[PDB]
Design a protein around this nucleic acid. Structure first.
Ligand SMILES: [Mg+2]
Ligand SMILES: [Mg+2]
Ligand SMILES: [Mg+2]
Ligand SMILES: [Mg+2]
Ligand SMILES: [Mg+2]
Ligand SMILES: [Mg+2]
Ligand SMILES: [Mg+2]
Ligand SMILES: [Mg+2]
Ligand SMILES: [Mg+2]
Ligand SMILES: [Mg+2]
Ligand SMILES: [Mg+2]
Ligand SMILES: [Mg+2]
Ligand SMILES: [Mg+2]
Ligand SMILES: [Mg+2]
Ligand SMILES: [Mg+2]
Ligand SMILES: [Mg+2]
Ligand SMILES: [Mg+2]
Lengths: 147, 187, 104, 52, 52, 127, 122, 129
RNA sequence: GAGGGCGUGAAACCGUUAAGAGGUAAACGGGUGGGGUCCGCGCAGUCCGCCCGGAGGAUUCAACCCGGCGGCGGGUCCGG
RNA sequence: CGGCUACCCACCCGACCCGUCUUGAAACACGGACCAAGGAGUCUAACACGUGCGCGAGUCGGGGGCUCGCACGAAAGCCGC
C-alpha cells in the first residue's frame, strides 16, 4: 500500500527523512558484511560473537538422514494412543497393559519427563533415556527394544 | 514558555482498542460502562486487558489454569481470563471448575464439557457477576515468548545468556571467537 | 443451487443475476465489494445441504474433513437487554447527571 | 442461538407446507472486517499482472 | 513482471468469511442497507421448490 | 454473453476489422432491414442492399414516405446514395447525401435467380 | 442483534451521505435524518416512521409488526390518517404514549408529522 | 427575509485573508495556494516581523460559528429530489445547494420542491428561462 | 464563436480598449480610506410559530356507545 | 443601503531573494530569463520488531490431484491412506 507508505507523507520535506548534513548517497560503509574485522568489529563482535574462525571436525558428506531420531517425552508418551484406549484398558480389569509403540507414531527415542501416572504400559522403541527407563520401572511398566 | 519542565504530553496509554473486531468493541462498550459505573476494580482491570493487544494477551494453558485453582481458597470461584485458554496434552484429570474466557480452543471446550465444567463468555460473566465477585482473574506466560529470549543488555559480553540471532543452531555458526577461550577471547 | 439441470440456462442472461453453487461458494460472489449481506435465493436441496456441508456446533461437517463452526464471542449479545437487565442495574452507583460548570 | 423453521415457497409464491429448519451457518458469527480482508486478498489473486 | 501479485489466504479464514457472508445474508437490515429492494419480498432466505 | 474463446469483445480489434474489412465482408456490413409486408411475404429479417433496390428512408434529415431508388453504393464509405435524396452545393449543382444503409427500410428488392437462391437459404435457415 | 446490525450498518451501507458536512441517512423508514442509533428504522425490532400519503392529502404511518422478523412482506403495517392536523397529532401521541411501543422518538415522530402537515396543506 | 433560521450569533473569522504563499507575487508559476516552506534561510519560516504570516492552529474559528454562511445556515449539496427531501427534519439550520451539473429541467422541480418543503436554497434563480 | 496542421485553446509574451497611479527600481505583510465591477434587498412599508379573550362566515369528526379489521401488552402459558 | 473579499490606487509602520553546503548567507558563495508538460525512496528475496486476524501443541497446501466444455473461471471449492 503506497497510500500507507511513509514516502507519500514525506513529500514536501527537502532531504526526505535522511538529513541535510549526513547525505545518504550510495553505500557509506560498504556492501553487506563489509569490514567484519577492520571497522565494524563493535557490531560483528558484541552482537554476533563466535563469527570468525574454525570450531571442530569436518565431516565430509554429512547427511541429515542417518542421525534421524525424533524424541518423544513422557508427557507425549500417552497421547500417541487415544485416551479411550488407556481408560478401557486399565479400568480395573486385570494386570494387563496397553502397548504404546512410538515407531508407528513416528518417534524413535523416548526421553524422560514427569507426569507418568500409576497405570503401567509397555513401550516399544529403538532408544531410551535411563531417566524414562527408571520412570517406567517405577510405575511398573516394561521396556522393549525394537528395530 | 511557562513550564520549565519537559513536555511528555500523552503518557503511554492505549484507550481505544486497535482491533476492528465488532464483538470485542461490544465487550469494550459493556465493560467500559461497568468499569465507570460499578466502582469495581476487577472491571477496571478486565477493561484494560480488553484494551490490551494481541501479543500481550498470552494464551493460558489448561494445566496452569488448573493449578491456579488448586490453591486453597479457590473452591467454587470462577477462573476469568481475558485471553484464550488452550488444551494441554500433559494432564489427565480435569476438575469440575468454571471458566470465563474468550475463544477457548475446541479440544479444551470438549474436555471441560466431558469433565463437567461450565464455560462462559464475558456477557454471561457480566450477567452473573457485575462487580466480579467470586472470580479469580488469571494471566499467562508473557515472558515465555521466543522473542523475549533474544532480549537483554547484550548477547554475549558478561556471557549474557541471551541467544544471538543465527540461522542454524549448530557447529560452524557463531562458535569460535568469543564463544571459547581457545580461539581468541571468551566473552 | 445444486444439481445444475438448466438453471444456468434460465438465469444466464438476466441482468445483475449471479450463477453460484452450493458445493463451490465464492466470497467474490457472496459479498462483492467486501460489503456483506447480498440477497440470495436458495433451493430445497441447497438449504438442506448447507447443514450437511458445514454442520452445527454439535456435529462436524460430514462433507468437509476437519471443519467445525467457529465459537461465538458473545452468546447472548443484545447489549440493550444486558444494560436494562435487573442484575446489572442492581449493582450501579447512581445516575450522576449534574454538570458543575465553570464558576466566574 | 436458536434455529427457527422457514417456509418453503412454491413457484407461484404460495407458501407450501414444507418447513426446513434453519441451518447454523446463518447463526455463525458475522465478521465483516474479516470478510473485507479475505475479499481483498482474493481480489489480488483474481488478476493478470499488468504491462512491463 | 515478478511483483508479488497473488496472495495466499488461510483456508480457515476463507471458510470463516464464507460463513460470515452467509450469516449476514440472512438479516434483512443488512441486505436492505446493502440496497436490494426487499419491500414486497417474502420471508428471508428464500427456499424455492426443486422444480425450479 | 460471449462464450467462444476465438472471437473478440476487444474494441480495438473490432474497430480494426470493421474499418479494414474487405468488400465481401462489407456487403454483409451494409445490410438493410425490410418492410413489414415484405418480411411477412418472404420470411426474412434483413438483406444486403444492391444497386437497384427501392428505399424508404426512416431516419435523418429525410424521414418516411419518400420511396426512391438507390444509385451508388460506396462500400469504402459505408454509404448508399439515393436518387430522391438531394442536396444543392454552393454553385447550384445537386449532389447525393450520405445515408448509412442501417437507417434504411427496403420496400422492394431486385429480382434475380441468385437472390431467389439467397432468399431460399434465408427461409430454410430461419426454419 | 440490533447492536451487531448497527456496528455493521453505521458505515459501508447503501446510505450515509458523508458529503463534506454532517451525515444523513435517507433511510426509507426514518423519523430524523441523522444516522444515529436511537433514530434508526431498519435495525430495531420496534420501528416507527411517518411518510406522506400517495393521495396527496394525509399522512401514512408505518410501524413494525414485531410479531415476526425476517419476513418483510408483512413486517411493516401502514395506516392512513387524514384529519385536521390536531386530531392526527393527538392520535399519534396516543398511539406512541399509551402503548409500550417506542417511548423514545415521540418528539421525532411528532415533529416530522407537524412539518409535513405544514408542507402539505398549501 | 425568506426563511430566517435560528439564533445565530455575531460570526467572526479572526482573519479573512486566506493566506498567500511566499513569493507568489514574484513568479507566476507559483499558484496562490499555501504551501509550508521548509528552507534553512527563509524569513517566513524564521517568522521575522513584516513578512507574511503562516497559518497555524490559532486562527481556528469558533465551533458555534464554524462553516456558517452569512445568512445563518450551513450549506449542503443536493443533486435530486431524494437528497432534497432528506433535509426535511433540519430545514431551519441546514440549507440546500443545487449541484452545478443539474440541468434546468430538473432544477426547476428541485427548487419547487424546496419551496414546498420550506428549505433554503442558495441559488434558486440561476439557469432559468 | 469548426474555413484545409481546421476539437477543446491555459500560461510565458504582445496589440488595443476600459479603469487607476507614477521622482526614492518594482514587488510584499499589518491596518484603514477612496474609487470601480458585481451580489442580496426595497429602500422613513417590511419578522415568524403557539395559546387565549373578541369580531364575521363555512364544515364535520372528536366527547359516549354500537359495527370492524390491523397492531402493542401480559394471565390460564387453556389448547399445539 | 450593506459587503469581507485573488480588482486598482493612496497613506503610517515593518520589511535585503529564494534553494542549499556551512558555526555563520541578502551576500563581492553557487543554481535560477520566463512559462507549460515529464521528473526523484519503487519492486523482489531474506531478517528483526510491533500491530491486526484465523487455528492453537500444533500450524500451513505455496507441490500436485479431483469438478461438465462456460465471460468474469489464469478465479473460487475440495483432498486427509
Ligand atoms: Mg521537518
Ligand atoms: Mg550516514
Ligand atoms: Mg505559554
Ligand atoms: Mg488491445
Ligand atoms: Mg540558519
Ligand atoms: Mg539563503
Ligand atoms: Mg482548432
Ligand atoms: Mg471548437
Ligand atoms: Mg467531438
Ligand atoms: Mg487568450
Ligand atoms: Mg490609460
Ligand atoms: Mg547545520
Ligand atoms: Mg567556511
Ligand atoms: Mg547567488
Ligand atoms: Mg546564473
Ligand atoms: Mg508536473
Ligand atoms: Mg507479529
Amino acid at each position: 500500500p503506497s497510500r500507507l507508505r511513509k514516502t507519500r507523507k514525506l513529500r514536501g520535506h527537502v532531504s526526505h527523512g535522511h538529513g541535510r548534513i549526513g547525505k545518504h548517497r550510495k553505500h557509506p560503509g560498504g556492501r553487506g558484511n563489509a569490514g567484519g574485522l577492520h571497522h565494524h568489529r563493535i557490531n560483528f563482535d558484541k552482537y554476533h560473537p563466535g563469527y570468525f574462525g574454525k570450531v571442530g571436525m569436518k565431516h565430509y558428506h554429512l547427511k541429515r538422514n542417518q542421525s534421524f531420531c525424533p524424541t518423544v517425552n513422557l508427557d507425549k508418551l500417552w497421547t500417541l494412543v487415544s485416551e479411550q484406549t488407556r481408560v478401557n484398558a486399565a479400568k480395573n480389569k486385570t494386570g494387563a497393559a496397553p502397548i504404546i509403540d512410538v515407531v508407528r507414531s513416528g518417534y524413535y527415542k523416548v526421553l524422560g519427563k514427569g507426569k507418568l501416572p500409576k497405570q503401567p504400559v509397555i513401550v516399544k522403541a529403538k532408544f531410551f533415556s535411563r531417566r524414562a527407563e527408571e520412570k517406567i520401572k517405577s510405575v511398573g511398566g516394561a521396556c522393549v527394544l525394537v528395530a | 514558555g511557562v513550564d520549565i519542565r519537559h513536555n511528555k504530553d500523552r503518557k503511554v496509554r492505549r484507550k481505544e482498542p486497535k482491533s476492528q473486531d465488532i464483538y470485542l468493541r461490544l465487550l469494550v462498550k459493556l465493560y467500559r460502562f461497568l468499569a465507570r459505573r460499578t466502582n469495581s476494580t476487577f472491571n477496571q482491570v478486565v477493561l484494560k486487558r480488553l484494551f490490551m493487544s494481541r501479543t500481550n494477551r498470552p494464551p493460558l494453558s489448561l494445566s496452569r489454569m488448573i493449578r491456579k485453582m488448586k490453591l486453597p481458597g479457590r473452591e467454587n470461584k470462577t477462573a476469568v481470563v481475558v485471553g484464550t485458554i488452550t488444551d494441554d496434552v500433559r494432564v489427565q484429570e480435569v476438575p469440575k471448575l468454571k471458566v470465563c474466557a474468550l475463544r477457548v480452543t475446541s479440544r479444551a471446550r470438549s474436555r471441560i464439557l466431558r469433565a463437567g465444567g461450565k464455560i462462559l463468555t464475558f456477557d454471561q460473566l457480566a450477567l452473573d457477576s457485575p462487580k466480579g465477585c467470586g472470580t479469580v482473574l488469571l494471566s499467562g506466560p508473557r515472558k515465555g515468548r521466543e522473542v523475549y529470549r533474544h532480549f537483554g543488555k547484550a548477547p554475549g559480553t558478561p556471557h549474557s545468556h541471551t541467544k544471538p540471532y543465527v540461522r542454524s543452531k549448530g557447529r560452524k555458526f557463531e562458535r569460535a571467537r568469543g564463544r571459547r577461550a581457545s580461539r581468541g577471547y571468551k566473552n | 443451487y445444486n444439481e445444475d439441470n438448466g438453471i444456468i440456462k434460465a438465469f444466464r442472461n438476466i441482468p445483475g443475476i449471479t450463477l453460484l453453487n452450493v458445493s463451490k461458494l465464492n466470497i467474490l460472489k457472496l459479498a462483492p465489494g467486501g460489503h456483506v449481506g447480498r440477497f440470495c435465493i436458495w433451493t430445497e436441496s441447497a438449504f438442506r445441504k448447507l447443514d450437511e456441508l458445514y454442520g452445527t456446533w454439535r456435529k462436524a461437517a460430514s462433507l468437509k474433513s476437519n471443519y467445525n463452526l467457529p465459537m461465538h464471542k458473545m452468546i447472548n449479545t443484545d447489549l440493550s437487554r444486558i444494560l436494562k437487565s435487573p442484575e446489572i442495574q442492581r449493582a450501579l452507583r447512581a445516575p450522576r447527571k449534574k454538570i458543575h460548570r465553570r464558576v466566574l | 442461538c436458536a434455529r427457527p423453521l422457514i417456509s418453503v415457497y412454491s413457484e407461484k409464491g404460495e407458501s407450501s407446507g414444507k418447513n426446513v429448519t434453519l441451518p447454523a451457518v446463518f447463526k455463525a458469527p458475522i465478521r465483516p472486517d474479516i470478510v473485507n480482508f479475505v475479499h481483498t486478498n482474493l481480489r489480488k489473486n483474481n488478476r493478470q499482472p499488468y504491462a512491463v | 513482471t515478478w511483483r508479488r501479485w497473488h496472495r495466499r489466504v488461510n483456508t480457515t479464514q476463507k471458510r470463516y468469511a464464507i460463513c460470515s457472508a452467509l450469516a449476514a445474508s440472512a438479516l434483512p437490515a443488512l441486505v436492505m442497507s446493502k440496497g436490494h429492494r426487499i419491500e414486497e419480498v417474502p420471508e428471508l432466505p428464500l427456499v424455492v421448490e426443486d422444480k425450479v | 454473453m460471449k462464450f467462444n474463446p476465438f472471437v473478440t469483445s476487444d474494441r480495438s480489434k473490432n474497430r480494426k476489422r470493421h474499418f479494414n474489412a474487405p468488400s465481401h465482408i462489407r456487403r454483409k456490413i451494409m445490410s438493410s432491414p425490410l418492410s413489414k409486408e415484405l418480411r411477412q411475404k418472404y420470411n426474412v429479417r434483413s438483406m444486403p442492399i444492391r444497386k437497384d433496390d427501392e428505399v424508404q428512408v426512416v431516419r435523418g434529415h429525410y424521414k418516411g414516405q419518400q420511396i426512391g431508388k438507390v444509385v451508388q453504393v460506396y462500400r469504402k464509405k459505408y454509404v448508399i446514395y439515393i436518387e430522391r435524396v438531394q442536396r444543392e452545393k454552393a454553385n447550384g449543382t445537386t449532389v447525393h447525401v450520405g445515408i448509412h444503409p442501417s437507417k434504411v427500410v427496403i420496400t422492394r428488392l431486385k429480382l434475380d435467380k441468385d437472390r431467389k437462391k439467397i432468399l431460399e437459404r434465408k427461409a430454410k435457415s430461419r426454419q | 442483534s440490533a447492536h451487531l446490525q448497527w456496528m455493521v450498518v453505521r458505515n459501508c451501507s447503501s446510505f450515509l451521505i458523508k458529503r463534506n458536512k454532517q451525515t444523513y441517512s435517507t433511510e426509507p423508514n426514518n423519523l430524523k435524518a441523522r444516522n444515529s442509533f436511537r433514530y434508526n428504522g431498519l435495525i430495531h425490532r420496534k420501528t416507527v416512521g411517518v411518510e406522506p400519503a400517495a393521495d396527496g392529502k394525509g399522512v401514512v404511518v408505518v410501524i413494525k409488526r414485531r410479531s415476526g422478523q425476517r419476513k418483510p412482506a408483512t413486517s411493516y403495517v401502514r395506516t392512513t390518517i387524514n384529519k385536521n392536523a390536531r386530531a392526527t397529532l393527538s392520535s399519534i401521541r396516543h398511539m406512541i404514549r399509551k402503548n409500550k411501543y417506542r417511548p423514545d422518538l415521540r418528539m421525532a415522530a411528532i415533529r416530522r408529522a407537524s412539518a409535513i402537515l405544514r408542507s402539505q396543506k398549501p | 427575509a425568506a426563511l430566517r433560521p435560528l439564533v445565530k450569533p455575531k460570526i467572526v473569522k479572526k482573519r479573512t485573508k486566506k493566506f498567500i504563499r511566499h513569493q507568489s507575487d514574484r513568479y507566476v508559476k507559483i499558484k496562490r495556494n499555501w504551501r509550508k516552506p521548509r528552507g534553512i534561510d527563509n524569513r517566513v519560516r524564521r517568522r521575522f516581523k513584516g513578512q507574511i504570516l503562516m497559518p497555524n492552529i490559532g486562527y481556528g474559528s469558533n465551533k458555534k460559528t464554524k462553516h456558517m454562511l452569512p445568512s445563518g445556515f450551513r450549506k449542503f449539496l443536493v443533486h435530486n429530489v431524494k437528497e432534497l427531501e432528506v433535509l426535511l427534519m433540519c430545514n431551519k439550520s441546514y440549507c440546500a445547494e443545487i449541484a452545478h451539473n443539474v440541468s434546468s429541467k430538473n432544477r426547476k422541480a428541485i427548487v419547487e420542491r424546496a419551496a414546498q418543503l420550506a428549505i433554503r436554497v442558495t441559488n434558486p434563480n440561476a439557469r432559468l428561462r
